[PDB]
Amino acid sequence: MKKLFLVFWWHMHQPLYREPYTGEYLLPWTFFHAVKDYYDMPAYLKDFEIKLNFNLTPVLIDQIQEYAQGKAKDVFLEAIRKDPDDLEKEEVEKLIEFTKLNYEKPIYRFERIRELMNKEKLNREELLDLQTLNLLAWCGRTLRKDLKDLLNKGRNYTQEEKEYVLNKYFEIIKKTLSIYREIKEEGKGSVSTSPYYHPLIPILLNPNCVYETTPNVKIPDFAVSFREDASKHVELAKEKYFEIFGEHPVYMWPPEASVSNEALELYYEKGINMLATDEVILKNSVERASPYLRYYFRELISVFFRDKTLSDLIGFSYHAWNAEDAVRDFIGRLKKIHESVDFQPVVFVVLDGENCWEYYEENGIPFLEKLYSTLEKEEWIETLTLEEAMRKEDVKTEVIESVKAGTWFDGNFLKWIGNKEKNEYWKILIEAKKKAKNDYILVAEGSDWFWWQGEEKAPFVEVFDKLFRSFVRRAQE
């Protein structure tokens, strides 16, 4: 029978929140996503007979390991552990501000949270509830089953009960890297990596790549070559991947799907056999092309193009859907894809694996469990690992000679460079790399720092600015 090959590729990344001087983690997002998604996303493979593929950045692996060993000095987390009698007025404001930010998300829908947020002042026991419910709001699928009776209480938590939650959370973190090894060794999925600190590789090699799609943009003067650092990002990433999995990575996910002719050349030289990028890149690069086909880039590397609609549905749209209606729509589009082509199509669904579920009901567990079990019983859909997709003779293959440089955000680099606020950061980077002495200059090259520049007065913009400027200063010493 004709089949549709489905490839799931989840992207797990966190910037280095660790201040180089104090060694203090200024944001808790590595810890919260570790307990909520970084372990439970591949743990689905133990309960559903499908294939899921994952990408892990080396910077996230670095932070996961530090949290697992207990060495991470997370300032926000220490306030949670601290008995509310020891909490200072400043610390309590952070806890209330954190709750206010995530108050809207369905994973924060606790009746107790409504009372505490509306209360004018909080005593010790109310703070204990606020400390623990913030912890329990980020419970993953695995620990939601184990900590069920605690989560049904919903209030009146003791300090020891809180510490039990932290203890169970740190057991998950220590096991998080093990399951990624486990799924890769057992053949249930393929695990890939990215250049170390999630940098924009095409910009590092040739900053002129921005003019490929946005010709009239004004970028700062790049008086320095970042081309050698772009190899350092790739080379050190493969070395870190070797530490975890005992082998060099053959598959890589370019950060922000950003690709270029020169970027693909550098990936090929470093032993990368396959990567993926956005289908808006496909439309800019190839005349009349389909994303449902394996692509040979100049007979050097294999490239796959994600389905932007299918991926953006999971990451942005389905959060406001019932689990049944969401999966029914998702399968319905695949059936339309199945009928639309005379060949057997391969569909690449690639997106961030941790940031959409916060806005789903029950962290999207009903959505994922319904979709994963639905895909199991659909015979015409064959979930494939990245390695399986690369050796599959049933997928059509085409040869392309060039790509127009750009990210998955509108096919251009404007979200990271182009306006005064973003251009100013690159001038800071360019001048710092002129006097850079150590490798902390690599951390400052991450796309996240330039992501949050300008845009708006979003939460933690001051914190991200503080981290980037601290890394720039440390690189010059």
Ligand X SMILES: C[C@H]1O[C@H](O[C@H]2[C@H](O)[C@@H](O)[C@@H](O[C@H]3[C@H](O)[C@@H](O)[C@@H](O)O[C@@H]3CO)O[C@@H]2CO)[C@H](O)[C@@H](O)[C@@H]1N[C@H]1C=C(CO)[C@@H](O)[C@H](O)[C@H]1O
Binding region for ligand X (CB under 6 A): 11, 13-15, 29, 33, 101-102, 256, 352, 354-355, 447-448, 451, 458-460
* DSSP code, position 396: -
Point out the residue whose Cβ comes nearest to ligand X.
448
CB of 186 to ligand X, least distance (A): 26
Backbone angles phi, psi at 277, to 5 degrees: -155, 180
Q: Quick one: 45 or 200, whose CB is closer to ligand X?
A: 200
CB of 104 to ligand X, least distance (A): 7
What SS3 class is residue 473?
A: helix
CB of 188 to ligand X, least distance (A): 23
Q: Quick one: 91 or 352, whose CB is closer to ligand X?
A: 352
Over the Cα atoms of the chain, what is R_g?
A: 23
CB of 335 to ligand X, least distance (A): 29
Q: What is the dihedral of CA 447, 347, 33, 38, to 10 degrees?
A: -110
Q: Quick one: 334 or 405, whose CB is closer to ligand X?
A: 405
Tokens matching residue 25: 């983690």
Distance CA 133, CA 152 (A): 11
Distance CA 366, CA 326 (A): 10
Q: Quick one: 138 or 372, whose CB is closer to ligand X?
A: 138
* CA atoms within 13 A of residue 406's CA, in its CB half-sphere: 22
Helices 111-118 and 124-137 pack at an angle, to 10 degrees, of 130
Q: Quick one: 352 or 369, whose CB is closer to ligand X?
A: 352
Q: Quick one: 11 or 370, whose CB is closer to ligand X?
A: 11
Distance CA 361, CA 329 (A): 17
**Span between the terminal Cα atoms of the chain, in Å:** 63
SS3 readout for 304-366: EEECHHHHHHHHHHHHHCCHHHHHHHHHHHHHHHHHHCCCCCEEEEEEECCCCHHHCHHHHHH
CB of 14 to ligand X, least distance (A): 5
CB of 391 to ligand X, least distance (A): 27
Q: Quick one: 10 or 372, whose CB is closer to ligand X?
A: 10
Distance CA 4, CA 343 (A): 9
Tokens matching residue 377: 């019983």
CB of 241 to ligand X, least distance (A): 17
CB of 314 to ligand X, least distance (A): 13
CB of 323 to ligand X, least distance (A): 22
Q: Quick one: 222 or 460, whose CB is closer to ligand X?
A: 460
Q: Quick one: 105 or 392, whose CB is closer to ligand X?
A: 105
Tokens matching residue 110: 């606790």
Distance CA 222, CA 200 (A): 15
Which amino acid belongs to residue 15? Answer: P
Q: Other CB atoms closer than 10 Å to residue 40's CB: what's the count?
A: 24
* DSSP code, position 35: I
Which amino acid belongs to residue 145? Answer: K
What SS3 class is residue 301?
A: strand
Of 182, 446, 397, 445, whose CA–CA distance to 274 is shortest?
397
Largest CA distance in the chain: 68
CB of 255 to ligand X, least distance (A): 7
Q: Quick one: 169 or 451, whose CB is closer to ligand X?
A: 451
Q: Quick one: 33 or 294, whose CB is closer to ligand X?
A: 33
How far from chain centre, in Å, is Cα 405?
Answer: 21
CB of 401 to ligand X, least distance (A): 27
